[PDB]
Amino acid sequence: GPSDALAALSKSTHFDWVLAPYDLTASRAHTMVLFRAGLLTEEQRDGLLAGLDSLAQDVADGSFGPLVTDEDVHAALERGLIDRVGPDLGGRLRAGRSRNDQVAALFRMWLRDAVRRVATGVLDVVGALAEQAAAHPSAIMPGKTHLQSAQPILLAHHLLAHAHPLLRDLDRIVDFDKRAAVSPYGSGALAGSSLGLDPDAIAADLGFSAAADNSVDATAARDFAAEAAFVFAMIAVDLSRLAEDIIVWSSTEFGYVTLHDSWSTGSSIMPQKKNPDIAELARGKSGRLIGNLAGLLATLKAQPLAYNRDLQEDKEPVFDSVAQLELLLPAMAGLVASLTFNVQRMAELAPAGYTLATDLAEWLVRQGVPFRSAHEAAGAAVRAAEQRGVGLQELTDDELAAISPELTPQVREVLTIEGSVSARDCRGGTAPGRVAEQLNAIGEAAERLRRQLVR
Amino acid sequence: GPSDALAALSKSTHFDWVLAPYDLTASRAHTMVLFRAGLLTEEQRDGLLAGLDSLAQDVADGSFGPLVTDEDVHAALERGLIDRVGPDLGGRLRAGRSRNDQVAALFRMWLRDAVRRVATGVLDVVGALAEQAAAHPSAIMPGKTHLQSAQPILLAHHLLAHAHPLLRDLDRIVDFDKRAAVSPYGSGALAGSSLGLDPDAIAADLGFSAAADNSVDATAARDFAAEAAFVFAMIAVDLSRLAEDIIVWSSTEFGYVTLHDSWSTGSSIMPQKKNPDIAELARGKSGRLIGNLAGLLATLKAQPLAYNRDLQEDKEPVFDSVAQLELLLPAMAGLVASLTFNVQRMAELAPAGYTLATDLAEWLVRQGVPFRSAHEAAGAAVRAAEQRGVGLQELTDDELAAISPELTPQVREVLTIEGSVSARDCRGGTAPGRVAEQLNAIGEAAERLRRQLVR
Amino acid sequence: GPSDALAALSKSTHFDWVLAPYDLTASRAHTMVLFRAGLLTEEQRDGLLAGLDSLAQDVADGSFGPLVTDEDVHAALERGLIDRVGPDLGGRLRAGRSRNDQVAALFRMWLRDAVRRVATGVLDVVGALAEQAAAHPSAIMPGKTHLQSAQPILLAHHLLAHAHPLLRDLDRIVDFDKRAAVSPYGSGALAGSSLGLDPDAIAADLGFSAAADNSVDATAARDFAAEAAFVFAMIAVDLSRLAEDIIVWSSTEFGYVTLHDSWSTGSSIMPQKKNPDIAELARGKSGRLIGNLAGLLATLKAQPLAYNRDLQEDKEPVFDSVAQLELLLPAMAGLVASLTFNVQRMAELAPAGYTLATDLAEWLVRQGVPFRSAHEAAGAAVRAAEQRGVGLQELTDDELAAISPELTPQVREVLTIEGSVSARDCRGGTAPGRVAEQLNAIGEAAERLRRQLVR
Amino acid sequence: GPSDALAALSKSTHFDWVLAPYDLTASRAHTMVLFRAGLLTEEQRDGLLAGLDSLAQDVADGSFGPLVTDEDVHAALERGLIDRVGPDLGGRLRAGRSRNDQVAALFRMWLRDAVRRVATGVLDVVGALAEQAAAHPSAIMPGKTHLQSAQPILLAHHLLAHAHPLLRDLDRIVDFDKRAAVSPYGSGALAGSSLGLDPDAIAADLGFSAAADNSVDATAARDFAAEAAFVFAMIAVDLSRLAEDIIVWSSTEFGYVTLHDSWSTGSSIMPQKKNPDIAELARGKSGRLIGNLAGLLATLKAQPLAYNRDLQEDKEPVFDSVAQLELLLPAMAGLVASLTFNVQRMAELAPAGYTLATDLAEWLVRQGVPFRSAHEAAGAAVRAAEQRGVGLQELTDDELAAISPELTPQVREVLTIEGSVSARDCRGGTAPGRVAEQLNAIGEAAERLRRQLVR
Secondary structure: OOOHHHHHHHOOHHHHHHHHHHHHHHHHHHHHHHHHHOOOOHHHHHHHHHHHHHHHHHHHHOOOOOOOOOOOHHHHHHHHHHHHHHHHHHHOOOOOOOOHHHHHHHHHHHHHHHHHHHHHHHHHHHHHHHHHHHHOOOOEEEEEEOOEEEEEEEHHHHHHHHHHHHHHHHHHHHHHHHHHOEEOOOOOOOOOOOOOOOHHHHHHHOOOOEEOOOHHHHHHOOHHHHHHHHHHHHHHHHHHHHHHHHHHHHOOOOOOEEOOOOOOEEOOOOOOOEEOHHHHHHHHHHHHHHHHHHHHHHHHOOOOOOOOHHHHHHHHHHHHHHHHHHHHHHHHHHHHHOOEEOHHHHHHHOOHHHOOHHHHHHHHHHOOOOHHHHHHHHHHHHHOOOOOOOOOOOOOHHHHHHHOOOOOHHHHHHOOHHHHHHHOOOOOOOOHHHHHHHHHHHHHHHHHHHHHOOO | OOOHHHHHHHOOOOOHHHHHHHHHHHHHHHHHHHHHOOOOOHHHHHHHHHHHHHHHHHHHOOOOOOOOOOOOHHHHHHHHHHHHHOOOOHHHHHOOOOOHHHHHHHHHHHHHHHHHHHHHHHHHHHHHHHHHHHOOOOOEEEEEEOOEEEEEEEHHHHHHHHHHHHHHHHHHHHHHHHHHOEEOOOOOOOOOOOOOOOHHHHHHHOOOOEEOOOHHHHHHOOHHHHHHHHHHHHHHHHHHHHHHHHHHHOOOOOOOEEOOOOOOEEOOOOOOOEEOHHHHHHHHHHHHHHHHHHHHHHHHOOOOOOOOHHHHHHHHHHHHHHHHHHHHHHHHHHHHHHOEEOHHHHHHHOOHHHOOHHHHHHHHHOOOOOOOHHHHHHHHHHHHHHHHOOOOOOOOHHHHHHHOOOOOHHHHHHOOHHHHHHHOOOOOOOOHHHHHHHHHHHHHHHHHHHHHOOO | OOOHHHHHHHOOOOOHHHHHHHHHHHHHHHHHHHHHHOOOOHHHHHHHHHHHHHHHHHHHHOOOOOOOOOOOHHHHHHHHHHHHHOHHHHOOOOOOOOHHHHHHHHHHHHHHHHHHHHHHHHHHHHHHHHHHHHHOOOOEEEEEEOOEEEEEEEHHHHHHHHHHHHHHHHHHHHHHHHHHOEEOOOOOOOOOOOOOOOHHHHHHHOOOOEEOOOHHHHHHOOHHHHHHHHHHHHHHHHHHHHHHHHHHHHOOOOOOEEOOHHHOEEOOOOOOOEEOHHHHHHHHHHHHHHHHHHHHHHHHOOOOOOOOHHHHHHHHHHHHHHHHHHHHHHHHHHHHHHOEEOHHHHHHHOOHHHOOHHHHHHHHHHHOOOHHHHHHHHHHHHHHHHHHOOOOOOOOHHHHHHOOOOOOOHHHHHHOHHHHHHHOOOOOOOOHHHHHHHHHHHHHHHHHHHHOOOO | OOOHHHHHHHOOHHHHHHHHHHHHHHHHHHHHHHHHHOOOOHHHHHHHHHHHHHHHHHHHHOOOOOOOOOOOHHHHHHHHHHHHHOHHHHOOOOOOOOHHHHHHHHHHHHHHHHHHHHHHHHHHHHHHHHHHHHHOOOOEEEEEEOOEEEEEEEHHHHHHHHHHHHHHHHHHHHHHHHHHOEEOOOOOOOOOOOOOOOHHHHHHHOOOOEEOOOHHHHHHOOHHHHHHHHHHHHHHHHHHHHHHHHHHHOOOOOOOEEOOHHHOEEOOOOOOOEEOHHHHHHHHHHHHHHHHHHHHHHHHOOOOOOOOHHHHHHHHHHHHHHHHHHHHHHHHHHHHHOOEEOHHHHHHHOOHHHOHHHHHHHHHHHHOOOHHHHHHHHHHHHHHHHHOOOOOOOOOHHHHHHHOOOOOHHHHHHOOHHHHHOOOOOOOOOOHHHHHHHHHHHHHHHHHHHHHOOO
């Protein structure tokens, strides 16, 4: 029989044991199928279902686990069922089964559960961001481009700006699930079942939306796994953007936020020194999940039809990612929920370097003033403000007039950060009303997606 | 000004000139918007419009292109506009314009076209496959698992098994477009526009489905780029599967297909021999597109909000991925179309190695025979046949009965590759009727997607 | 204190426990250093040493392992140490120790062992290849480009062609180790130790070649791990090449090899139908390891100095890769060793399709006749042989002359695959003497690569 | 003929034209091979030499370039040669040449040059770092882990901490070149040349260190390309780290550095803003190069021997990488050299959060005082320093005596950041003497990588 190297190489129980409940459900469905085929009398159907539920309980509480001699979870569960109903009844269940459609189907079921757990996590992070946004709706911070100060924005607008990529990720999940909800059961080894089963029925009972249109493809294609891997990589990356922001904020130089004791690691001697370990692990993790994606794609590359053992490599890179997300998403959520914001710091740094010059110029542009004329007028205002070591609002009215008769005192409406953010009242702008509408639109969108994912 | 090294590093006119018609369209739309706001008189409206159509046609014909002094396509285009309507008169157009929402928007506008050219290529490959499948309604080949001869299948079933993944990728394109169809115009540099412009209308006239919900996210996020890159990599990978099958089939050892001279390379000295260079390039390319995706996701990783110069790296990997596909998709479509299938060779190899043994077992299985007994029976039948050196079919009833009385001569209905494939009449099975329904369905689905991508 | 999500996220005991022996070695050396600096009396050195040997032994036998409350291997190991020598003696070991240089050093040592193991495996595969190359010294197979029959080559030449890249990988291992052999001990957190210890001595005691030249870099940089990941991915890729060849050869259509039962999966109904599962797992895992490399590099990207928690992500990918190879390398080595070569099939296919014509053309070119002519001569020979149907060697001398006045009777020598492959008598050629010399050379090179790894 | 699609797909003249000079040197070597074979007339021979010189000058001036009908650089160059010496003197050079060793050899040579250009760039960046380090010998900044202030370090130490990885990369370059210096000339298409040439001689005249040992492997392997790709990716990542440091430093919040006008950029938002574009483009391009590496490895995966057209995809990613680095390395080197460090700001932030208390504890540990005792003492010291809002230095002698009698006034020695950094005198430590010695060692070692890369 098999050599030691081969046995050790092919063994998959350690990661694939998570497929057991799904394999059991599959065995139940196949039990009913065999009943409808005439290959199972009633006596036999009850025997098998009883054995499967007993095995299900024993798998749940932990009484049944894989042996070293077990190659995978399926061999393990057939072994257990045989141990519970004997070989004669047990062997009755193996009629009309193939492994190639089974591994694909089970991977799909598991994946459709996992993607929804991850979806829950994403909604947690979004919820934390939205809650902090609502808790701090008026705090103004310097908006950053090239990590340099641009226009002042509401803190809420920034946080929600981290919320939207995740909503997009949820959209990706919803879209992915539709391609995932296709049952390969009935495809046999590759050529299709000869048992005369009804693939639509089998598909319906196991929670799939439809049966596959092509057995060969149903058993050979793993693009659903690749798509999942991608979506998870994308979620990881967005999380890494948020993470980067929090890490930068947490620095003593920035001091935009102060970390919670429960949601960070602290120093033994330096009493108030806290490290953003959660954010950094998220950041570092994103690379990991990107790697899982690229690796999976490399594995699927140049695959001749139909099934090859290569495809057994589909699960572990996906699995891992999910695991990481299942660790990362709630953590980050808490990390976002626990943030304390130094709003005076942010309001101090928001109008620095005469940022608001921009707004001045823009105002002039709104007033029909030529664009260049407006901008050198702004430059003049800045030069005439660093004249007194003074703000732009503080500038004498004469100067507004001495630079341009177009500069009515009305401009002051945008020479303060409050007025600056209030002036941008277009859809998606950092204006209070717009940010509020955006926030509730986020609420409704989240509700729509979560509603869209129920089964 | 800028040092030579910086200028060399920042130059992008060698790849981004393909955005020119989109920048021009955006400039016309912004002319409308600015006029709507009253910041422009009619003479100017069509002054700028005339200048922009002049520039447009001179960009199409080739008269106007980037100079070495030009940094990007935008600087080039406004240099031209300035040359065509005056130096500051052209500077009027800058009113209410930022670069950050612009680069995102233009990338999107380019991408929604690129993805549809790619979609046309994919549909061409699907078309070729479907046609070869139809032109061989009865051709039977060995089904492959581990590149070993499994159950016999229709060649049509194989080719269509290469058609469905591409259909799924088309589905992915369709889904992606909904997220790509969001305009970031009005998002300014970071915070919203303060000009009182309507992002909705601007979105409508530029061909977008909606405007962005958050300015910061709209100018910072590049996940649509990552999604596009992924979809391209997926298409490339499925193409690599098709390519692998073709490279294997083209070997003298396989001889499943004979390549066309036009679509392959060969030696003058020995004319019969041909090399599947297109499939090989597809295979090698898939890795390159995978790499584009991976690299892009690494680039988007750990980006602090909002816009950073890092994001300029969003274009080139996607561009490449499109470029390559725009080369590979028709090429492949030619290859598949020009393939001559040696039907009798595949028909000959189909029942080899006593493959049909499996079918025998299955027949027994639906007669109500235990799974292991029905399989050893098959082993016995195969062993008896091997000594005789004859096919399983050319076996007298008395041996069928000496192996098992359950083996009535009826069993022979599935000992013929024709009866073998005929027996698998389940949905997505390789039975001629089911395959026919599948092919018609592939036509209807491809047509439906094609319809779904029109604007 | 720390939340459940943070504790769960931070927990690393499931993969990092393999660092325990190395940490205990580190604590040993550190104990010695501590004494000779004057920080420990000798009863305390005895105590600490004894505690560390006890803890080492119980870690080895398995009686001591990590609890669920243990965050990492270090927390566990000093938990055990404190349980074995008390908090006052154990707490005095912490003198002049920090996490950041420690973790880097431990990873380095572990990696220096792991790479060697992998090296042993690679040498095993190389050995199997050389063995088969010796066992088949005269077997001629058709050489493949584009998976198409090019010039005939010795089977030995092909197998050794698979041997050389692995030798290059071993070279990469030798080169890698030198950068790996740099102790970061004495670097502290980042600024260096203030205990007045000698980092070079500590380095020598733990098997390093030198101490780091910069503490900050020593604790921050993980380029050695990325390099390891690359060497592993390269090994995996070469293995995937070999694997591809074996998978194609094992196909019934090719029939170049027959698989061993103990080193493949097959059926018992169809006894001589065997699947090359090992090669396939190698193929997919190659993609996996590529993924690990790309991901790790993505994780190291945009890392601000010095140490970040991001770097904790350096181990799991690398680890994984090593694990994979440690399963793959013997398996492959077994597979190659177990292969049966159908020399008659390969030999029969070698001169097919007038392959040998190219050799004849080369011979004509050597005389010095025009290259176009010789080719001119050769195509002519091909069809004069085609219509008659005789092999190029079955053409009467007079016949050879009518199509070229240069074709002498002797030219027949390169018309047999033996003489043709012998004709290529140039270094690296497929001539028997040459392949023999390169085999001997492979032996010498392999056994020299081996020594440079012994410490 | 070849179809349009195939010709479009096969075209490589847009990227491979850089190989032309190498192709000419190769044609020269080949002319020598032919001369030695006596297949050429010495009059013919120098006819060919003159022709190839002419072609060389014609590539130099630019008068000769590729046409749209030319598929690759080799076709173009032989077309040119034919146009310069006639079709039958030029037709005679074709003798004994195949492209499969040609392309690999040319790629190898080009790579041996490109790797040295990159090398010079890296050395420039290192030199800039050393320059800045020497320019600031006593500057003290807050050491960072988790982007949080830890132990104070010299600015020079940080910059050099960025210098060392690049030195390692130069070492990787040195190691790589030795595997790159293996000539595949004489390997023919696959089985080796039959011309009776001396591969060693060709290898000598073309600048290689040795000739290949196996023709098949010499033509099929591309692991040199993969390794080059890796080295370039690694360099890009270290550069990404430096870049991240600078981007963060350039923030108004940090204010560690101020950017130079010629090595920085001005937003289109405000003119008084200077963004660090060079660093950001380095940061993203790092991801790009990672993508090139991963993609290349994916392409090389599952490649059956020998040459496949897949391998044509070896060049473009590698090329890309080189190009990117050739833009990045000087730029960065300028960026670093142009940096103005706000040393007083950093010095002000250095002793913050009572970080020096760490040092305090460490001092005690060095006195003979055990660990926990020392940290108890440090904690208490922080608690007093803390009540009056005073530094640990400010506290009077009596309070220190009270915390622990081991706190002789000698302790202040490390309560100043200067004495803090001066306590760390071990190799790699932030002690000025040690940092100086490190700098000198860096100088000579860099001069050693530069010596090693000169031929």
